[PDB]
Amino acid sequence: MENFQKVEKIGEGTYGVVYKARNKLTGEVVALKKIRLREISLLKELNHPNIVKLLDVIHTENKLYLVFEFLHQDLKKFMDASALTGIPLPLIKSYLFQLLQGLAFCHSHRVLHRDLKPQNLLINTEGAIKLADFGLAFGVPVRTYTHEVVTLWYRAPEILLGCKYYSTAVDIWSLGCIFAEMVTRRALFPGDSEIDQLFRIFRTLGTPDEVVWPGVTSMPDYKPSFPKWARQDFSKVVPPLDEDGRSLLSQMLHYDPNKRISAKAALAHPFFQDVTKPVPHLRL
Numbered sequence: 001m002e003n004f005q006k007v008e009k010i011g012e013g014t015y016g017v018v019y020k021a022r023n024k025l026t027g028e029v030v031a032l033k034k035i036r037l038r039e040i041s042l043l044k045e046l047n048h049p050n051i052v053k054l055l056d057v058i059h060t061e062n063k064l065y066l067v068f069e070f071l072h073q074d075l076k077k078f079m080d081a082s083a084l085t086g087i088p089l090p091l092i093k094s095y096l097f098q099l100l101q102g103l104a105f106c107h108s109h110r111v112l113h114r115d116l117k118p119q120n121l122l123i124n125t126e127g128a129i130k131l132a133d134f135g136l137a138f139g140v141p142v143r144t145y146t147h148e149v150v151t152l153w154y155r156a157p158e159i160l161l162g163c164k165y166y167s168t169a170v171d172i173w174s175l176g177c178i179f180a181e182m183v184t185r186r187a188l189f190p191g192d193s194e195i196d197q198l199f200r201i202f203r204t205l206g207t208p209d210e211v212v213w214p215g216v217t218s219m220p221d222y223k224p225s226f227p228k229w230a231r232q233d234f235s236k237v238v239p240p241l242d243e244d245g246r247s248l249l250s251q252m253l254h255y256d257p258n259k260r261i262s263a264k265a266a267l268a269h270p271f272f273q274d275v276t277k278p279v280p281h282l283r284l
């Protein structure tokens, strides 16, 4: 990376440290992911307006560097700055639509993100929002990485129940959780452990059974001993979101991965009949 000048450290993940850096050859400002030591090469071709562009992939001396286009802020920071007032519905709708477009795209190419969450959604002054840090199906764990409370909050139930070969539906679930959070200004299922996460989901949506989710009782980590919670009134979940929004959210949160709405179909939902592209006011 002799052609890269580090500007400042942005953060640390479980297996990689991220830096804001400058490309001496292009003058370009980028984000660098340093991982201590093929599927990645395919990501370099997964180009979309709503996917953070992977500019370069460099493997040198037991070190793997991923060079990404730089964006100044993530959705998490923006929501916090908008906690007092709340992100205007038009903008929430625009962000949801754009991400659904991004997912419709990657899913059509058989690529799953696997770890959607506010901090993995980057935004710019142009009103765009992009999917970042796509996850694989490796490297030396960063010893100094600090635990993050939001880590499991967006995990689909099939992952928590031990599904080994989950589908693109996991991303829809995660996005649905993010949608709910933008609307209510509070995480939907803030669990701090896998079982707590599962039970928080169960408490709201009801403990799944063969009726609503065929095959759920045969899943790896399913336990007949799970407490039985009855699904609560859905109007209680994201007030004061309108029925178009609640309807879409309910379809994004279906327990059965096969019944959960696809990104492609979601784009056609009535909720987006009046979708527009507002300009957010960002403080950088």
Ligand SMILES: COc1ccc(F)c(F)c1C(=O)c1cnc(NC2CCN(S(C)(=O)=O)CC2)nc1N
Residues within 6 Å of the ligand: 010, 013, 016, 017, 018, 031, 032, 033, 034, 052, 068, 069, 070, 071, 072, 073, 074, 077, 078, 119, 120, 121, 122, 132, 133
């Ligand atoms: C979340 O995105 C990533 C996650 C892991 C990783 F290894 C990465 F390289 C990225 C990544 O591509 C990436 C990370 N950060 C940034 N810019 C930061 C600047 C600070 N804002 S802030 C705190 O002011 O809101 C948050 C976004 N731009 C990027 N392009």
